[PDB]
Structure 1
Amino acid sequence: AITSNEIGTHDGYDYEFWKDSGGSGSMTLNSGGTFSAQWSNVNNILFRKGKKFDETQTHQQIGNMSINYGATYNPNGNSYLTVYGWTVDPLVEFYIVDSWGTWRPPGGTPKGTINVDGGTYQIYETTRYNQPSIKGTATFQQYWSVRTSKRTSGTISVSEHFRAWESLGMNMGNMYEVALTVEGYQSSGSANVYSNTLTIGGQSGGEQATRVEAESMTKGGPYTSNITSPFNGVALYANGDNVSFNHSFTKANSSFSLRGASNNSNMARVDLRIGGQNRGTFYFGDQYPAVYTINNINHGIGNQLVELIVTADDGTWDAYLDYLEIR
């Protein structure tokens, strides 16, 4: 188990154990986002598993964030069960607190409230003066959403809180981290986070879908042509044959579903490009219509060129395209 300050990645999740002097702590990393923790007579201790970012993107550019979790939570003293993280420029430490120990944080007068995920959160902004931070000993703002009543399982719509904060004038910088966290202050305790899933993107923005017919897009290359069998669509025959269109992306992540087919029993490949960058390859194994889906594409909001292009043709197959759905 982890008993001193450590940063790493475990089963795809970025984890961290942090304490200052005094007392002891133990963190045990389990599968997915899960972990158990125990602490005894600490000054400050933090256990978390989530994602660290490279400090280059806002939370809008990263996309919709949501955490689904469940915890056995037994603090003995001052403690939080909370989503936690940081932004830079401005340097901000933030909290979405769902439960706590003996003291409901953070004191002071709320700047607002948000009703979300079946509860009510009061929103606070505080200041830390010459305190430990990701940038050393520093003075920085703290943003809080604190539930009006305790709960230790459910879904936390992280992006909703970020937008709530920002509308109340609490500017956020580029993201540094988002993680489900157990914090202790001047206390002891144990906790078992048995469920902890951080999801970026694909939430119930996935039940609307935009279908763009291949035959309605702009044709390019030497031979691209319309077809009517095995569906209304286009055929891409040689390298450089392509179909493309400008799309106005409202959100930052999407899945792309191409319905198509090869002309014969050889496997056809169609490349996906956004803004001129390859983002993956659609595969059609045979002559029967099939839908191939490339999920979890981060591309950023705004109007961008979408291309579907054949680059690996060698005269043994053509590609037939019916439509592309963007979710």
Structure 2
Amino acid sequence: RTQPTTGTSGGYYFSFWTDTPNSVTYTNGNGGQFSMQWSGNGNHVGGKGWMPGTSRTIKYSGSYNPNGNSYLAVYGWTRNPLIEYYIVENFGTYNPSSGGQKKGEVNVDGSVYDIYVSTRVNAPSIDGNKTFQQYWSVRRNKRSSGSVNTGAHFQAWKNVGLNLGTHDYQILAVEGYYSSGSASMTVSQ
């Protein structure tokens, strides 16, 4: 019953979703810039990227400041099979991959990522209420700027048996869940 405000801005595809519009302010800037700012109640996920996504190298920079449940990550979806994937570059409080079965590890882009897999039952997705899997690559050394070899993560996932379907959208997402925080992030290739 909540569908995301999608579109184009600065030569990039953008997606911004929230169940509490008054708790969060999402703003598109020139180029690949976007700024999100939130506090209090609500679930907010916003960002800029590509549609569809692929095995590309995603450069990004800017400031990211969390206070509670929040993450800065390369975030996207695939179909057949339906899969939500994360390349968590940064996060606050709470490790978003908590409760995720660890499938392995991978060393890429100046750090080591832990690989997890979890399952969401009867949860909101790009195809509405469905049961789907989530792939996780969590960066041990958090950062707010750098580059992400998504293809490398996809390969490392494919090794441990976490295969993907045909890609939907692929954005640099800032997320906040019943917390406060703010980020000004510019994306690039």
Q: CA deviation at 1:22?
A: 7.1
Question: 1:87-146 deviations in whole A, cap 9, x for unaligned?
Answer: 000000000001101112212342110000000000000001111110001110000100
> Take 2:165 and 2:132, find their aligned partners in 1: how far apart are those partners?
12
- 3-state DSSP class of the match of 2:152? helix
TM-score (norm 1): 0.55
Alpha-carbon contact 1:47-1:183 (below 8 Å) kept: yes
Question: Match of 1:180?
Answer: 172
Matched letter for residue 137 of structure 1: N
- 3-state DSSP class of the match of 1:132? strand
Q: How does 1:272-283 map to 2 (within 5 A)?
A: none
Matched letter for residue 125 of structure 2: S
Question: Match of 2:17?
Answer: 18
> Take 2:151 and 2:41, find their aligned partners in 1: how far apart are those partners?
32
> Take 2:27 and 2:21, find their aligned partners in 1: how far apart are those partners?
20
Question: Match of 2:33?
Answer: 34
Q: How does 1:1-327 map to 2 (within 5 A)?
A: 5-21=4-20, 24-53=23-52, 62=54, 64-108=55-99, 109-193=101-185, 195-197=186-188, 199=189
Alpha-carbon contact 1:85-1:93 (below 8 Å) kept: yes
Alpha-carbon contact 1:87-1:172 (below 8 Å) kept: yes
> Take 1:192 and 1:86, find their aligned partners in 2: how far apart are those partners?
23
Q: CA deviation at 1:77?
A: 0.5
Question: 1:270-326 deviations in whole A, cap 9, x for unaligned?
Answer: xxxxxxxxxxxxxxxxxxxxxxxxxxxxxxxxxxxxxxxxxxxxxxxxxxxxxxxxx
**Structure 2: runs of 5 or more not aligned:** none
- 3-state DSSP class of the match of 1:36? strand
> Take 1:142 and 1:129, find their aligned partners in 2: how far apart are those partners?
11
Q: CA deviation at 1:5?
A: 4.4
Alpha-carbon contact 1:22-1:42 (below 8 Å) kept: no
- 3-state DSSP class of the match of 1:111? strand
- 3-state DSSP class of the match of 1:170? coil
Alpha-carbon contact 1:22-1:41 (below 8 Å) kept: no
> Take 1:120 and 1:71, find their aligned partners in 2: how far apart are those partners?
22
> Take 2:153 and 2:4, find their aligned partners in 1: how far apart are those partners?
29
Cα RMSD over matched residues?
Answer: 1.6
What's the % identity of the aligned pairs? 49
- 3-state DSSP class of the match of 2:179? strand
**Structure 1: runs of 5 or more not aligned:** 54-58, 200-327
- 3-state DSSP class of the match of 1:9? strand
TM-score (norm 2): 0.93
Question: Match of 1:301?
Answer: none
Q: CA deviation at 1:23?
A: 5.1
> Take 2:56 and 2:4, find their aligned partners in 1: how far apart are those partners?
27
- 3-state DSSP class of the match of 2:141? coil
- 3-state DSSP class of the match of 1:130? strand
Matched letter for residue 76 of structure 2: G
Alpha-carbon contact 2:23-2:42 (below 8 Å) kept: no
* Runs (4+) off by over 2 Å: none
Alpha-carbon contact 2:73-2:87 (below 8 Å) kept: yes
**22-31 or 68-77, larger mean C-alpha shift:** 22-31
> Take 2:50 and 2:21, find their aligned partners in 1: how far apart are those partners?
28
